[PDB]
Amino acid sequence: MKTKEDMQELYFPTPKLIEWENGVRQYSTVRGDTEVLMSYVPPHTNVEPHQHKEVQIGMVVSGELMMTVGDVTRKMTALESAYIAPPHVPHGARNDTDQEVIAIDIKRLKADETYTSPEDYFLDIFKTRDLLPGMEVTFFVEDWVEIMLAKIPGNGGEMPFHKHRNEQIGICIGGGYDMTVEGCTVEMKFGTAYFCEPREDHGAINRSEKESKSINIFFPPRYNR
Ligand SMILES: O=C(O)C(=O)Cc1ccccc1
Ligand SMILES: [Co+2]
Ligand SMILES: [Co+2]
Ligand SMILES: [Fe+3]
């Protein structure tokens, strides 16, 4: 027995706003062992190095960010790179530009997961292709995680309703569309996050007049095994 509002809090949890002294603002959404943070990093601003037991996956959605993981510093272009900072590995960043950076982090710690990364921490685009006709996706791949950018066209662009054992978590980064998880449909906006546990049915349809974009993350990988 799950109410409408009950289900909303599970699959599309209400974010909290976090503000740091340095000026960074974060929108934080949580379900169980996984946290999604959308960060707004102001111009010419440092994010002090730190480290934690949780693994963290990061990506720039807008702007350009100087990112440090371990002793590897790398310029991050919007949506063209991701990094993984394994547990306890120190990491921080600087917005070294005149413009605000919008970024996304996933912080996670779940049993029976080994958190590896490329030797230099950063992932480049593995492959871009249509997942479904007209639906362009872009993959970033590790053993235990698969990042999939998706463009869902307007005018009926749709991911049919389905499920899989893979956990799938994500966040809308453009336009709008309807997403349903089990018995719950939400109109996604920029920043709306969703969390699907194993075997929870879900789908999406974009009945707007323009394409929408999303970031979707599989644990473990679903397409590039
Ligand atoms: O490929 C899947 O398993 C998906 O769930 C794809 C997807 C894309 C956009 C919104 C929801 C699901
Ligand atoms: Co961190
Ligand atoms: Co899915
Ligand atoms: Fe239309």
Side-chain angles (χ1 to χ4, degrees):
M1 288 273 288
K2 265 136 37 205
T3 188
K4 224 58 171 178
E5 25 297 309
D6 267 1
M7 271 169 142
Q8 163 287 132
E9 297 172 321
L10 269 177
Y11 318 130
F12 308 105
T14 303
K16 306 175 170 185
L17 165 71
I18 302 176
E19 292 212 353
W20 308 61
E21 164 184 326
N22 70 359
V24 164
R25 293 167 35 252
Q26 299 178 313
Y27 291 87
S28 164
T29 70
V30 171
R31 183 188 185 169
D33 285 321
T34 307
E35 179 179 11
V36 172
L37 301 132
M38 168 159 292
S39 302
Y40 292 76
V41 182
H44 316 282
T45 295
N46 297 314
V47 178
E48 230 58 342
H50 83 153
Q51 57 169 243
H52 34 73
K53 67 186 181 192
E54 290 91 357
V55 66
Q56 177 170 310
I57 310 163
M59 187 178 317
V60 171
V61 171
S62 191
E64 176 185 291
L65 188 76
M66 296 302 309
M67 183 80 206
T68 301
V69 184
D71 57 16
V72 169
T73 290
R74 198 66 61 82
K75 176 181 294 171
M76 300 189 69
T77 282
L79 299 185
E80 295 180 0
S81 347
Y83 71 87
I84 291 169
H88 313 288
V89 177
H91 55 282
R94 171 178 180 76
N95 181 352
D96 198 39
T97 82
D98 287 323
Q99 316 291 132
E100 159 183 272
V101 164
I102 302 181
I104 237 80
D105 292 312
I106 294 53
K107 180 149 68 196
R108 180 183 177 88
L109 181 47
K110 170 172 195 179
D112 295 313
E113 294 198 334
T114 294
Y115 303 108
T116 55
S117 72
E119 230 195 66
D120 55 8
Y121 306 116
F122 291 82
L123 294 292
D124 285 87
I125 300 176
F126 177 71
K127 166 72 179 286
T128 297
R129 64 171 183 95
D130 286 355
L131 177 55
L132 295 172
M135 178 182 292
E136 170 187 299
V137 291
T138 300
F139 288 105
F140 304 80
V141 185
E142 249 290 347
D143 298 351
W144 59 279
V145 58
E146 178 169 59
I147 300 185
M148 194 187 68
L149 286 36
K151 298 183 190 183
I152 296 180
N155 301 299
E158 174 178 19
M159 168 57 60
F161 197 61
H162 69 275
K163 28 96 101 146
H164 35 71
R165 188 213 288 123
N166 320 60
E167 168 170 347
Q168 181 181 330
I169 298 166
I171 186 158
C172 168
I173 53 167
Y177 53 105
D178 276 2
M179 193 177 64
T180 133
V181 177
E182 293 289 342
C184 180
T185 302
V186 162
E187 293 188 57
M188 306 285 279
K189 304 190 279 85
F190 184 90
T192 316
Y194 75 80
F195 297 75
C196 303
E197 286 293 293
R199 305 147 58 245
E200 293 182 337
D201 303 67
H202 58 282
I205 186 169
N206 176 356
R207 282 184 273 246
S208 81
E209 303 307 293
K210 68 185 184 310
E211 71 159 32
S212 57
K213 302 205 44 176
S214 60
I215 301 170
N216 316 274
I217 306 177
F218 302 90
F219 310 96
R222 166 160 154 86
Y223 299 99
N224 298 283
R225 294 177 181 253

